[PDB]
C-alpha cells in the first residue's frame, strides 16, 4: 500500500534499525568467517614453513627425498584439533540448524560444514583439504620417514599443493564475498540517505 | 525537516531513481571499460598472430620494424578510446575516482582538454617497443639464441600482464553485477 505515510523522523530510525540489523547479522558474520579462515590458513602457512626442516635429501645416490611424515602428520592433526572449536559462524554459542544451513549455502559447502555440538549447530571450518593430506600421507608406505624417489615425490607433492591451492581458492572467494558484502552495505547506506 | 511526512509511494520513486543512477553511473561504466579494453587486446593479438612469421632462423632473426609498426598502430587506434567515460570528458576528481576503482595498471588519467578522461594504459605496449628498440638492427635483426629467449620471455610477460589485466577487470565487473543484484534483493523486500 503506497498511501501509508511515515514521518521523516520515523524513517531515520527505521533506517538506523535496518542498518544495524544488517551489520550485525551479515557484515560481522562475514568478517568473522573471513577472520577464522585466514587464521586457520595462517597456522597451516606455519606448517609449510616448518615443512622445510621435515624434508632433506636421502637415499643411496641422494636424488630422493626423506620426508619425516610423522612430524608432518603430527602438525596437520594439531591444526585440526585446534579449529574443531573455532567455527566460521557463529563466533559465540550456537544457532539453529536452518540458520547454520542458511549460512553454509552463503559461504559455500566447500569452505564450511554444518556440525551439531548437541542441541545447537555451527558452521565449522571444512577441514577436507587437511584430512585429504593426512590420508595421502597415510598411504605413502611405512609408519615413519619414507624415502621418496623424484618420481613418487612428484606425485605426492602435486596433490599436497593442490589441497593447499584449494584452501587459498577457498580463502580468496571468502575474501571476495566479504568485499561485496561491505559494498552492498555501503550502497545500501547511500540509497537510504537519498530520501532526505 | 524532521516532521515532514512521506508516503511509501514516494519512497519507491526515490529508490528507483538511485537504482537507475547506479546502473548508468556504475554498472554501465564498468560494462564499457571492459569492452574497450577487450577490443584493444583482441587487436593486440595482431602483433601476436604475426609473431610466428616474423621469426625465422639466422640463430634467430626477427622482423622488428614490422613488429614495431604494428604496436605503434595499436597505440594510435586506442589513443582516444578511453575506458571511462564512454563519451565526452569528466572531472579530474571524477576521473581519479575510477582510476582507483579500476587500478592504475590498466587506466591512466589524461587531460584531453579542460576536462579529463581515463585512457587505456598502454604501458605494456610501450614496454615491448622499448625492448624492441634495444635490440638494434637495420630493420631486420638477427639475434643470438640467448636473446631471442630472453626477449621472447619478457615480451610474452607483457602480454601476460594484459591478459591478467583484462580478466581482473572482467571479474571486477561481474562482482559489480553481484553487488547490484543483491542490492536490489534486500531493497525489493526489506
Residue numbers in the entry:
A (entry chain B): 124 to 319
B (entry chain A): 124 to 181, 187 to 318
Excerpt from the publication:
Like many Gram-negative pathogens, Shigella rely on their type three secretion system (T3SS) to inject effector proteins into eukaryotic host cells, driving both cellular invasion and evasion of host immune responses. Studies in Shigella have demonstrated that bile salts found in the small intestine (e.g., deoxycholate (DOC)) interact directly with the injectisome tip complex protein invasion plasmid antigen D (IpaD) to support interaction with the hydrophobic translocator protein IpaB and its stable recruitment to the maturing tip complex. In Shigella, IpaD resides at the extracellular tip of the injectisome where it functions as a “gatekeeper” that prevents unwanted protein secretion (leakage) through the injectisome prior to requisite activation events. Here, we uncover critical mechanistic details of the Shigella-specific DOC signaling process by describing the role of a π-helix secondary structure element within the T3SS tip protein invasion plasmid antigen D (IpaD).
A small number of groups, including our own, have crystallized IpaD and IpaD mutants and while some full-length IpaD structures have been solved, proteolytic cleavage of the N-terminal domain facilitates crystallization. Here, we mimicked the previously successful native proteolytic cleavage by engineering IpaDWT, IpaDΔQ148, and IpaDΔY149 to lack their N terminal 121 residues. These N-terminal truncation constructs expressed and purified well in E. coli and diffracting crystals of IpaDΔ1–121, WT and IpaDΔ1–121, ΔQ148 formed overnight by vapor diffusion. Careful consideration of the WT structure suggested that the localized i + 5 hydrogen bonding pattern of the π-helix results from the “insertion” of an amino acid into this region and that removing either the glutamine at position 148 or the tyrosine at position 149 would eliminate the π-helix and return it to a continuous i + 4 hydrogen bonding α-helix. Aligning the IpaDΔ1–121, WT and IpaDΔ1–121, ΔQ148 structures additionally shows that Y149 sterically prevents the F308 rotamer change in the WT π-helix structure. Notably, while very modest conformational changes are observed in the crystal structures as a result of DOC binding to either the IpaDΔ1–121, WT or IpaDΔ1–121, ΔQ148 structures, the removal of the π-helix in both the apo and bound conditions results in a lateral shift of the central helices relative to the WT structure, resulting in a 7 Å translation of the distal ends of the structures.
